[PDB]
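Dock bromide ion; give full complex structure.
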Amino acid sequence: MEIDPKDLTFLKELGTGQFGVVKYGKWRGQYDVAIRMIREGSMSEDEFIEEAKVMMNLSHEKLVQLYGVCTKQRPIFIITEYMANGCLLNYLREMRHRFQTQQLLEMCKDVCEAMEYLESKQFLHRDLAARNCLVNDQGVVKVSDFGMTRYVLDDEYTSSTGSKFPVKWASPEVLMYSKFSSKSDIWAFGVLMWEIYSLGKMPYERFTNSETAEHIAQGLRLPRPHLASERVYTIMYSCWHEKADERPSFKILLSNILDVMDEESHHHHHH
Ligand SMILES: */C(C)=C\C(=O)N1CCC[C@H]1c1nc(-c2ccc(C(=O)Nc3ccccn3)cc2)c2c(N)nccn12
Ligand SMILES: [Br-]
Ligand SMILES: [Br-]
Ligand SMILES: [Br-]
Ligand SMILES: [Br-]
């Protein structure tokens, strides 16, 4: 897991993500990799380094693969699979010019498979959203940054009442009681489905975080995206049940997505 930084070559600046600068490079002169440089003073590094070992034991084809870390240095490096098509949000914005609606449901399936795996390992993502999903060269979507917000030092990001908290993806019990679970990830997954079918539109774009909380407390939810059929909207709406126990698991949700795929292929075969 501990990688020698001398085995890394930096070839292209990719930009800066939530958790620091990211660069494309080669590992051992053989493998394409993305190199995340954790921003100084942003993480509880001691706890993160211990949690990083648990994140390393996770492996699934729809999870962005982690190769290792460089911790005998400052800044810390995280070495990961390189996702050629970049962040899902930017990818969705570009899809507005050419796409087929079936592709959107396939994207939801990819993420749901990744979350079903994390669910089976009792591993919470805690900030599932399009901004944390990446797309490879084949258009496959993969989930990343699972569990990374646990040890963010800025309380404005981790506190349910913080100004930077992902309120617009948070379930009621997260906003009111800071109760995180796979069922809160389910809620966020529903919002992520809405993001995909809105082709990267921000949920509750014209809402303040305070107005969003009141909106959710009133039992109101996001509107049906124009590209989402009623059958598809039923799935993402099931993620938004007021009570966590009434939301489906990722295992059930994946089967529901596959079933709707069959219904969609017969959309014109009913009276
Ligand atoms: C948005 C989805 C991505 C994003 O904001 N950026 C900014 C730079 C270009 C792009 C990007 N980020 C990554 C990337 C790299 C590493 C990690 C990571 O360390 N994940 C992690 C650590 C621990 C536990 C779980 N996950 C996440 C994201 C990236 C990659 N890999 N390829 C291309 C572009 N890109
Ligand atoms: Br560079
Ligand atoms: Br088509
Ligand atoms: Br609760
Ligand atoms: Br809205």
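Observed: The chain is about 35% helix and 15% strand.
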